[PDB]
Design an enzyme around this catalytic site. Sequence first.
Site, PDB file in Angstrom:
ATOM      1  N   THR A 159       5.427  -6.602  10.944  1.00  0.00           N
ATOM      2  CA  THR A 159       5.826  -5.210  11.290  1.00  0.00           C
ATOM      3  C   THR A 159       5.013  -4.662  12.459  1.00  0.00           C
ATOM      4  OG1 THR A 159       4.436  -4.428   9.546  1.00  0.00           O
ATOM      5  CG2 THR A 159       6.790  -4.739   9.027  1.00  0.00           C
TER       6      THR A 159
ATOM      7  N   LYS B 157       6.020  -2.359  15.958  1.00  0.00           N
ATOM      8  CA  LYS B 157       5.257  -1.212  16.413  1.00  0.00           C
ATOM      9  C   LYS B 157       5.025  -1.297  17.917  1.00  0.00           C
ATOM     10  CE  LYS B 157       2.974  -1.299  11.968  1.00  0.00           C
ATOM     11  NZ  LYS B 157       1.720  -1.460  11.246  1.00  0.00           N
TER      12      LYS B 157
ATOM     13  N   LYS C 122      -3.959  -7.537  13.318  1.00  0.00           N
ATOM     14  CA  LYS C 122      -3.394  -8.012  12.031  1.00  0.00           C
ATOM     15  C   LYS C 122      -4.532  -8.649  11.228  1.00  0.00           C
ATOM     16  CE  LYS C 122      -0.557 -10.595  14.501  1.00  0.00           C
ATOM     17  NZ  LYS C 122       0.757 -10.125  14.001  1.00  0.00           N
ATOM     18  N   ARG C 123      -4.339  -8.768   9.912  1.00  0.00           N
ATOM     19  CA  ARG C 123      -5.333  -9.422   9.042  1.00  0.00           C
ATOM     20  C   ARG C 123      -5.633 -10.805   9.629  1.00  0.00           C
ATOM     21  NH1 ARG C 123      -6.524  -7.213   3.987  1.00  0.00           N
ATOM     22  NH2 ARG C 123      -7.984  -8.973   3.943  1.00  0.00           N
TER      23      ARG C 123
ATOM     24  N   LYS D 199      -1.552 -16.918  10.904  1.00  0.00           N
ATOM     25  CA  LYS D 199      -1.318 -15.952  11.999  1.00  0.00           C
ATOM     26  C   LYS D 199      -1.936 -16.465  13.316  1.00  0.00           C
ATOM     27  CE  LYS D 199      -1.276 -11.970   8.751  1.00  0.00           C
ATOM     28  NZ  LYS D 199      -0.082 -11.160   9.084  1.00  0.00           N
TER      29      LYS D 199
ATOM     30  N   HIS E 236       8.246 -11.133  -0.348  1.00  0.00           N
ATOM     31  CA  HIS E 236       7.581 -10.899   0.964  1.00  0.00           C
ATOM     32  C   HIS E 236       6.961 -12.172   1.535  1.00  0.00           C
ATOM     33  CE1 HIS E 236       7.672  -6.446   0.977  1.00  0.00           C
ATOM     34  NE2 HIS E 236       7.750  -6.636  -0.352  1.00  0.00           N
TER      35      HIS E 236
HETATM   36  O1  LIG Z   1       7.153  -7.299   4.207  1.00  0.00           O
HETATM   37  C1  LIG Z   1       5.893  -6.734   4.579  1.00  0.00           C
HETATM   38  C2  LIG Z   1       4.869  -7.830   4.932  1.00  0.00           C
HETATM   39  O2  LIG Z   1       4.446  -8.454   3.708  1.00  0.00           O
HETATM   40  C3  LIG Z   1       3.416  -9.395   3.986  1.00  0.00           C
HETATM   41  C4  LIG Z   1       2.864  -9.900   2.666  1.00  0.00           C
HETATM   42  N1  LIG Z   1       1.856  -9.352   1.979  1.00  0.00           N
HETATM   43  C5  LIG Z   1       1.565  -9.997   0.814  1.00  0.00           C
HETATM   44  C6  LIG Z   1       0.557  -9.616  -0.016  1.00  0.00           C
HETATM   45  C7  LIG Z   1       0.230 -10.306  -1.195  1.00  0.00           C
HETATM   46  C8  LIG Z   1      -0.814  -9.888  -2.025  1.00  0.00           C
HETATM   47  C9  LIG Z   1      -1.560  -8.766  -1.687  1.00  0.00           C
HETATM   48  C10 LIG Z   1      -1.250  -8.063  -0.526  1.00  0.00           C
HETATM   49  C11 LIG Z   1      -0.208  -8.487   0.291  1.00  0.00           C
HETATM   50  C12 LIG Z   1       2.369 -11.054   0.597  1.00  0.00           C
HETATM   51  S1  LIG Z   1       3.428 -11.151   1.880  1.00  0.00           S
HETATM   52  C13 LIG Z   1       3.993 -10.555   4.831  1.00  0.00           C
HETATM   53  O3  LIG Z   1       2.980 -11.526   5.069  1.00  0.00           O
HETATM   54  C14 LIG Z   1       4.516  -9.999   6.174  1.00  0.00           C
HETATM   55  O4  LIG Z   1       5.177 -11.034   6.966  1.00  0.00           O
HETATM   56  C15 LIG Z   1       5.486  -8.868   5.888  1.00  0.00           C
HETATM   57  O5  LIG Z   1       5.839  -8.236   7.122  1.00  0.00           O
HETATM   58  C1  LIG Z   2       1.484  -2.591  10.709  1.00  0.00           C
HETATM   59  C2  LIG Z   2       0.142  -2.975  10.236  1.00  0.00           C
HETATM   60  C3  LIG Z   2      -0.137  -4.257   9.727  1.00  0.00           C
HETATM   61  C4  LIG Z   2       0.880  -5.359   9.658  1.00  0.00           C
HETATM   62  O1  LIG Z   2       0.812  -6.071  10.922  1.00  0.00           O
HETATM   63  P1  LIG Z   2       1.360  -7.573  11.067  1.00  0.00           P
HETATM   64  O2  LIG Z   2       1.067  -7.856  12.515  1.00  0.00           O
HETATM   65  O3  LIG Z   2       2.855  -7.502  10.700  1.00  0.00           O
HETATM   66  O4  LIG Z   2       0.546  -8.441  10.139  1.00  0.00           O
HETATM   67  C5  LIG Z   2      -1.409  -4.519   9.304  1.00  0.00           C
HETATM   68  N1  LIG Z   2      -2.394  -3.605   9.349  1.00  0.00           N
HETATM   69  C6  LIG Z   2      -2.154  -2.376   9.790  1.00  0.00           C
HETATM   70  C7  LIG Z   2      -3.284  -1.406   9.825  1.00  0.00           C
HETATM   71  C8  LIG Z   2      -0.894  -2.023  10.259  1.00  0.00           C
HETATM   72  O5  LIG Z   2      -0.708  -0.757  10.731  1.00  0.00           O
END
Ligand SMILES: OC[C@H]1O[C@@H](c2nc(-c3ccccc3)cs2)[C@H](O)[C@@H](O)[C@@H]1O
Ligand SMILES: *Cc1c(COP(=O)(O)O)cnc(C)c1O
Lengths: 810, 810
Positions: free
Chosen positions: A650, A654, A542-543, A548, A351
């Site tokens: 993602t 949305k 987003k986070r 970002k 990811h």
């Molecule tokens: O594929 C789903 C999404 O995964 C996100 C990602 N999360 C992590 C992640 C690591 C540790 C704890 C929680 C989360 C790594 S990449 C990515 O940052 C996003 O780009 C991607 O859309």
């Molecule tokens: C879909 C979703 C995300 C992921 O959003 P990104 O813009 O792809 O980082 C994060 N948080 C919540 C609550 C979501 O529903």
Amino acid sequence: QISVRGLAGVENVTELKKNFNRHLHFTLVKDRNVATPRDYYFALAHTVRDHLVGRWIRTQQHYYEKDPKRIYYLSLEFYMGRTLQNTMVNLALENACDEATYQLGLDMEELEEIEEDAGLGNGGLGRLAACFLDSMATLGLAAYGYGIRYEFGIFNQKICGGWQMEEADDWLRYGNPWEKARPEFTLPVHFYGRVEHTSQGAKWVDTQVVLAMPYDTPVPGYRNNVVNTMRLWSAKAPNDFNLGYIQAVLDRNLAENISRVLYPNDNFFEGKELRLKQEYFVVAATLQDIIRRFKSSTNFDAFPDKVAIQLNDTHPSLAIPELMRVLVDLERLDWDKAWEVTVKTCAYTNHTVLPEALERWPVHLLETLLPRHLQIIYEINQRFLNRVAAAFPGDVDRLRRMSLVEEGAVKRINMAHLCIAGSHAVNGVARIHSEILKKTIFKDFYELEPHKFQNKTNGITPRRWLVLCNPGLAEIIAERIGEEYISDLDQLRKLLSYVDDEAFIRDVAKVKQENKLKFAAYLEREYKVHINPNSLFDVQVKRIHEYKRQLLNCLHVITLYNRIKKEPNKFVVPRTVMIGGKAAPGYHMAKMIIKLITAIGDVVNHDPVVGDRLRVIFLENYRVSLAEKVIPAADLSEQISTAGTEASGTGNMKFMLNGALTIGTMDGANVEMAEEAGEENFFIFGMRVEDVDRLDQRGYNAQEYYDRIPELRQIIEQLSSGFFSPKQPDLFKDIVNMLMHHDRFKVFADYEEYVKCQERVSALYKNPREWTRMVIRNIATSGKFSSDRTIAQYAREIWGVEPSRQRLPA
Amino acid sequence: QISVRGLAGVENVTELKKNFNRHLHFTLVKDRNVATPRDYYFALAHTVRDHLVGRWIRTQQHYYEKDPKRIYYLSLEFYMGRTLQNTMVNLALENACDEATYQLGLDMEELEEIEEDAGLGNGGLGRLAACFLDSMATLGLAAYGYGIRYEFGIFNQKICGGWQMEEADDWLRYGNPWEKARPEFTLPVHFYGRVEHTSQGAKWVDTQVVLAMPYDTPVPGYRNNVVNTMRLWSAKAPNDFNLGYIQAVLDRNLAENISRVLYPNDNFFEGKELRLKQEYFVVAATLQDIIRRFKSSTNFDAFPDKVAIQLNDTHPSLAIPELMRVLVDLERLDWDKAWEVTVKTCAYTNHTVLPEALERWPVHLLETLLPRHLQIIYEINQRFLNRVAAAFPGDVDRLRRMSLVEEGAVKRINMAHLCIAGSHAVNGVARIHSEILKKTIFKDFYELEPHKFQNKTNGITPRRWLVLCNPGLAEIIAERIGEEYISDLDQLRKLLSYVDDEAFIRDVAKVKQENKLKFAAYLEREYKVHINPNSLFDVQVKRIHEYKRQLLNCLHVITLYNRIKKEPNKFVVPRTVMIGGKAAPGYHMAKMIIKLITAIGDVVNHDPVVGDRLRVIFLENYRVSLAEKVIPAADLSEQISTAGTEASGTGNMKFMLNGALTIGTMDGANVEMAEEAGEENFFIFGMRVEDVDRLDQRGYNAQEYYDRIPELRQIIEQLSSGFFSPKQPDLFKDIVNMLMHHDRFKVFADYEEYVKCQERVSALYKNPREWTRMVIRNIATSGKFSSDRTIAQYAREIWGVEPSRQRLPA
Ligand SMILES: OC[C@H]1O[C@@H](c2nc(-c3ccccc3)cs2)[C@H](O)[C@@H](O)[C@@H]1O
Ligand SMILES: *Cc1c(COP(=O)(O)O)cnc(C)c1O
Ligand SMILES: OC[C@H]1O[C@@H](c2nc(-c3ccccc3)cs2)[C@H](O)[C@@H](O)[C@@H]1O
Ligand SMILES: *Cc1c(COP(=O)(O)O)cnc(C)c1O
């Protein structure tokens, strides 16, 4: 009321009403004179859950008779959100429940708002797991989600003095009506101990036992009467645990800490022991369950014909050495045969490429906690490196770079390397991300095993992310082209023939205006704040992350503010700029960014000259249920990650589904979104991946942009001098200093192209009809981004199973 | 089958069966092909609970309309046992459920055995609370049990190598179907902080908050359709608690520790902080609830007309200063008026005279944890000692002896003194115990306030302790004299006219023989041990204590063994000697006694010469559900406490009701039991209270008994020399040394009279007809020992309320 919410049969409504009153009496032990809104929500939840029970028992029954190949989705995160509305949507109960509740003098929307989010995830990765379970049930796959029932999910975010404060997400306080505890399927999990070698092979002894107790949550397919299972493990001490007396009983909490709390880091690695215990706990209890189900159909040759295990990033990478340990130490298979079984069973989804997110566990930790797994990991590495040596004789550097063991002051295990070695398939999560995996971080592994590397572009469930959150848009679409698109989102292309229809243009813009009114009212009722619903809703949710680039958005916002002040009596398209997201509690810079966003709001929202032409709002406690409200209300989606940092995203999908235009970089799934809609229907700006690489080879000098762009210099001088922090002049010195000297994400390099592209957005918003025609072009090409497409590709190209849209019997 | 188990109406049985199958499907999410005995028990529990719901809602409703005076029973212990059979008995559902389960191919007795004991108590005191709730519901009093929902009750006792091992009683693992969580009635409880004095009086500030969340359990009356409430508090952290992030969330367990575990000391004081937190927690949450209910009817003059608070020993003594604090600091009543209200509201039951059981809290603990309560306690003491000084001018010694504050290296608060000062009524729990209170430990308080001191002799509920555990005896009684005795136990006197009836003599002895067969079979099936059911069942079951003199019983058992060996070919009445009970985990001597009992068994049970003439059995894990099995199987009840040590006892009453003869001292309720049945129908032996006093004045020399009694000397020499511990010759030196030099309970002084009295028991057992006629004389005079009598006396003479046997409507 509306057609895609199903029928309200007279019998059906009567039946719902008597069962609601039965649960209020017998389940909740309330009469109607003492019940609260919360009691009414519980009575409805129990009533709707009763419609799941028959289908759930039947489905699990069918899977026992037919014995299909079973899919196991291993994740440390399932970001589910609320269950009640989703359950009603998927069983076609929504209008019947609205009618039933209406006649008992209750408002169902009000009762829905009482449900707590199941926030067992950080963001994209957790929510992808949730969308996947929905798509797996909808496509009739014999699929199981396995994770951890955290007592505390992602923290509740409060803002105090514009700063993030964290509160414990006590989501189980009032009880979870959706889960069923199965303490009879409780399984032991081992930690610590040491390895004895005997005649009869290796033996893991003197271990500490923790019990894994499963809770089952139903996952209904979309109107197919399929109900799959999400099984989450809870940590329980054994009863002889520590067994002066009192302290022994109190110390059971040590062992139960394992399932206590979700780690709140998004796309970041924290090498803490409690986290490694979480990763082993879910893997050890899950594999035992998988093997038990398999044996209830001696011979493990057929294991991979009956079992697929998907690893959601490296978080459950220990599934690989654990499966070896079970097959070698307990089932007494020879190493080579057990390894064949493991590789054909396991597949790994990567990811991220951000180096600080890659799991690299110190050896001393694994040595103490999982001594046998470390021996198996060393054995894997030796045999893997023997195949590299044979294919690339003399390439000693390759050997060091591909090793599962990293040399250094501290030796580490590269869990990503373990996953590629031990998996038959490795996928990224968007075409550009999967290409970057083969060109850069896994280039060596690609050259050894090209056949393992795939793309599976991410998706979102159009059930939660259209029907559920945006019923009005669902309905105007269903009026033209019918209901069938909900389980076949590619059918949205038929909307391209409606792009010059005045009636449809009026309806699309009317739904958007209703969502904005409804969301503006929601802001006033829950957070006392006045916004203009005629303004362009510019939304980045987003986070909070440097990659970002919420900071790039901040720079644009301050630019608009400075332009208004320079020329107060000139016309500008009004905007409500809304930014929302949680920062990881330890992420100092992410916390400063939140503080800067609120500091900007404090200045621009109280400037009389600005009027209602520019508002800056920080959306508190961004979570799945807030996303269901604000994403349908959005006009502009901000997807502005530095090219090559956002693996997919993602949120982007949305918003495309819900009638917002995208301003974004050619990053992640943005590239395929633009390709589907046409580049002319997308606000593309900034460096490509290739441009960032060229800047890196040369050196990124932020000073060059500060010297050449007066508009940018003015903003940096404002930040430094305390224009936005009058009481603490130097509050933001860390932000300035990062932007000027150590910006890994090159915010200034994209500044100029971002502001010009934002001007192109304002110009189009001035022409509602052409804005709306561009929105229709986006919605109508959004079909690819259905998680139904994604899961069908996983099933055909990785798991070796045929999806199905055939109903089970009711 | 039998008549006192109620009707099995055709409609009734059909209805139970469809609801059983509804709960199996919808509640448990099982089909009949995968259900276990445990699922079947849960399906039945849920089905029977549904019959409570209507009656529970209605009863609480009635109490709101009628607004009667409310009784609050505050206890740290409710020893409930199992709920399912008791619920069926009290709703007359037992035969209908037997029939309903029978037709679904299940055995109800087998499903009953799956329910866990709610073991929220140590022994007599906890079980008196449970019997009281049953009697309060049966006599239609608006009564509430308030205590703590411990996550872990009294430990499970295993025997290993004849030693006590403790296991955590994880009674909630599988869920409690009887409780209803009420998180909406959650209340704050304060700890620590400090006291600020202002213009507006004293203010408790900078406190730590712990939340008290109530769980409600229904308490059905006997066939009167009354269902009262037992409310137990659980500790929950507030969500900003400790709020790096992870550790803060993990540290919530500090605060939730308060409701984690029952302290396992019977009739002993351990001055630990966690215990004081338990005592304040139940009192603070309860008083807030009492005052809220009261205000939902300004003026506290009527508080004592609407509220009685009964304190179960000193464990909730802080109710007194807490009520003052609420009335003075929060309601702003003047001190004198608040004190009047407190005294007329509160009554104190004393349960012991053993000095090591009296709660004497160090001042430094109260200073740190409850600073305001300590100020209020000092103020109470000063005003109380001013009334003593005025009534007894110049008696400075009286002042020191009656003080609530004890002087010493550590200052302590005497909570018993606080309770007498702050209560309008002080009662003991048997006539001899209440007399001892006035003659010795509370003589000073009696002379000041003679009117406060009452007797309320203890009782047992004949519902659990006859109908439920001994249906066969219930039935033969009901054949002669009808059902009405079950709620009017004095009617058992009518059985005296059946003492020369051959048919009734045969039936009483037949039921006893069936109970022994059934209990002997139970020993074989669960603990692989061969016992003679024709032998006299000599049973001592109760917590392991020096004062209860299990050791005197041991000495008798070794005497019988030595007599058999001296004269192997002489006839002796065969006996199964069964001793059972838990030792407090820290009580070294109690643990040695268990070990000696098993050591004796190891020798006498494997002596070929003994045959089946003498067996010694240690009954593992003595608890309420084991008492329901063994007490009906018993022939001889052992009640052999040193005179003046057992305040009442209640096991004694259970056995009298169930057709065992008593061997006992003139201690506790034994005195009134003998008085009711006639001394000639009781095996009375040993020192009276007066005899023990005479021995104390002179000095107890155990050596004198060792020199004069050869039979006793031989036993001491056997213990010393390792006759009973061949591998550890000196294992029992601590026991010998205690018996010879520091026996507070004068075991040797009663030895000779005990053995002779035991010979009188054996002689009567040789004549079955006269044994059984004596049993009838015991059962027929056992009516006084109904907790219905006890509660009617509390209600009339303490609480100022009229009991009632009138049915509510169904
Ligand atoms: O594929 C789903 C999404 O995964 C996100 C990602 N999360 C992590 C992640 C690591 C540790 C704890 C929680 C989360 C790594 S990449 C990515 O940052 C996003 O780009 C991607 O859309
Ligand atoms: C879909 C979703 C995300 C992921 O959003 P990104 O813009 O792809 O980082 C994060 N948080 C919540 C609550 C979501 O529903
Ligand atoms: O009145 C009920 C019974 O109370 C018993 C008693 N328990 C305690 C007791 C103290 C602390 C913790 C648990 C328990 C003190 S006295 C007494 O020892 C018994 O004699 C009496 O029958
Ligand atoms: C009744 C009872 C007691 C009290 O018995 P005593 O002989 O009065 O000490 C203790 N434990 C249990 C389980 C009981 O049922």
